[PDB]
């Protein structure tokens, strides 16, 4: 993995040693070259994972997350450079440095063999993320959003630290390759119930699980655009990735320990989808949409079937590109009208025709139109939960109806109807904004022609 870690680190001296006005050009160009080289991780075998060394390894689960991670950095740089234009140069460079350091922690997090190494890097992502929100957020509430984000995560992660260290003492290792062979069944006892919870609750807060989700809408409403993109596209997936790995050593106890969390997720997805129909803040609506989508991922991970693990992996990738796109679309309006209220500016298709097409395409993927990878992932999860219990089709079906309703309602309210008379600073879309939207949707729709590369190890 050093062929990715070192060039990622080199983005820092590149940014600091760049000419004053070439910080955005240089960092964007070279982080795209890194993204290009990330496709060499596609050397995935049918039996063995790609095991580079004692420290790092890739398999079909981490590879798509790694490529999404490295593709998102240049996108976050284009998204951020406009609202940071009046910032002084040193503080712009520090902002870019926080993004670079976040990518460094993320690519190491997804490739660590040893679970304590995963834990530390998984935790290290908190620091830059918190700094980005609290330092470069816009409004007063960003200080509270930072505190909720920090302490929700730590309330879960600290018990995980105890459980992992406990596991190593008993088993002798936390290397994931070893755990695949030395794993032993978890027998029923109160000790193992709390070991199960300590192993899972940290990842559940990250997803986030319904009931532990209220931190997410606060963080998104307060974060700058790049903070929202990384939060939605990748940071939520640390919980999914962690659960996908650690469930290996929690069998068969997961058979009954999952029930309360399946009920929360199955019911939670309907409640959060219905909540989206009444949200007034556009960033808050997209944040609730993420909770609804990630509820399927939690269910898929917990029922542990080949089809659901394939569905979970595809949904994680599809949601990352879609939700990041929606935040960018919402931000482009915000950079014009300086308000997140969804009803403030209406009829925008009349004033920004092409940008209205990006809205349409983003909404179609959000409601999972076939054959988008958003549907492939959702369909696979729906198939597997039907076998788990036929009744779930009713909850899944209702959610798909409500999801279409709020996805189009968001499109109809902002893009259709009559334009707001008094708003007269709706300037034409910039090339930067159009390129930003198309760098989300084009890779997303191209993946439809070759879905296997995002279906994970169970493919």
């Amino acid at each position: 993995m050093l062929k990715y870690i070192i060039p990622t680190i080199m983005l820092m001296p590149l940014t600091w040693l760049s000419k004053n006005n070439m910080i955005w050009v240089n960092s964007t160009a070279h982080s795209l070259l890194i993204s290009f080289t990330s496709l060499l991780l596609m050397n995935q075998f049918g039996d063995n994972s790609l095991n580079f060394s004692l420290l790092f390894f890739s398999d079909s689960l981490s590879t798509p997350l790694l490529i999404l991670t490295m593709w998102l950095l240049p996108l976050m740089l284009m998204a951020s450079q406009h609202h940071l234009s009046k910032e002084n140069l040193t503080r712009k460079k520090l902002f870019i440095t926080m993004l670079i350091s976040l990518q460094l922690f993320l690519i190491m997090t997804f490739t660590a063999m040893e679970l304590i190494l995963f834990y530390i890097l998984f935790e290290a992502t908190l620091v830059p993320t918190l700094i980005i929100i609290t330092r470069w957020g816009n409004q007063t509430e960003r200080l509270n959003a930072g505190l909720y984000f920090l302490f929700y995560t730590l309330a879960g992660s600290l018990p995980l630290l105890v459980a992992l260290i406990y596991i190593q003492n008993t088993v002798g290792s936390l290397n994931f390759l070893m755990l695949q062979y030395w794993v032993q069944p978890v027998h029923n006892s109160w000790s193992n119930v709390f070991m199960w919870l300590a192993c899972m609750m940290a990842f559940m807060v990250k997803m986030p699980l319904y009931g532990l989700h209220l931190w997410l809408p606060k963080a998104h409403v307060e974060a700058p655009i790049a903070g929202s993109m990384v939060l939605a596209a990748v940071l939520l997936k640390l919980g999914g990735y962690g659960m996908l790995r650690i469930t290996l050593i929690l069998n068969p106890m997961t058979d009954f320990m999952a029930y309360p969390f399946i009920m929360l997720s199955l019911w939670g997805m309907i409640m959060t989808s219905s909540i989206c129909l009444r949200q007034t803040d556009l960033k808050s609506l997209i944040a609730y949409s993420s909770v609804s989508h990630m509820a399927l991922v939690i269910v898929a991970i917990l029922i542990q079937t080949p089809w659901s693990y394939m569905g979970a992996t595809a949904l994680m990738i599809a949601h990352g590109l879609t939700s990041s796109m929606l935040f960018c679309l919402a931000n482009s309006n915000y950079e014009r009208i300086h308000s997140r209220t969804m009803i403030l500016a209406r009829g925008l298709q009349t004033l920004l025709p092409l940008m209205a097409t990006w809205w349409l395409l983003a909404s179609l993927t959000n409601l999972a139109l076939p054959p988008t990878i958003n549907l492939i992932g959702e369909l696979f999860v729906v198939m597997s939960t039907f076998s788990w219990s036929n009744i779930t089709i009713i909850l899944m079906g209702v959610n798909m109806v409500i999801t279409a309703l709020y996805s189009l309602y968001m499109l109809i309210m902002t893009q259709r109807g009559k334009y707001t008379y008094h708003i007269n600073n709706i300037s034409p879309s910039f090339t930067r904004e159009n390129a930003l939207m198309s760098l989300h949707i084009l890779p997303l729709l191209l993946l439809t022609l070759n879905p296997k590369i995002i279906l994970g190890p169970l493919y």
Partner: protein
């Protein structure tokens, strides 16, 4: 024929001939505990380093 000992004489350490056998265990002491197994060998590098969590050295 008695001669008074000179200054310093009576404080001399002298030697005595005795047929009394030399005491063997005057303190009546039990057997001493055996020492811990002494460690002897060649000091080799630690196998795979510290072995602390994820560290390779």
């Amino acid at each position: 024929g008695w001669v008074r000992p000179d200054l310093g004489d009576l404080s001399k350490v002298t030697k005595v001939k005795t047929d009394r056998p030399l005491p063997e265990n005057p303190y009546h002491s039990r057997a001493r505990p055996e020492p811990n197994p002494e460690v002897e060998g060649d000091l080799k590098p630690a196998r795979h380093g510290s072995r602390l969590f994820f560290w390779t050295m």
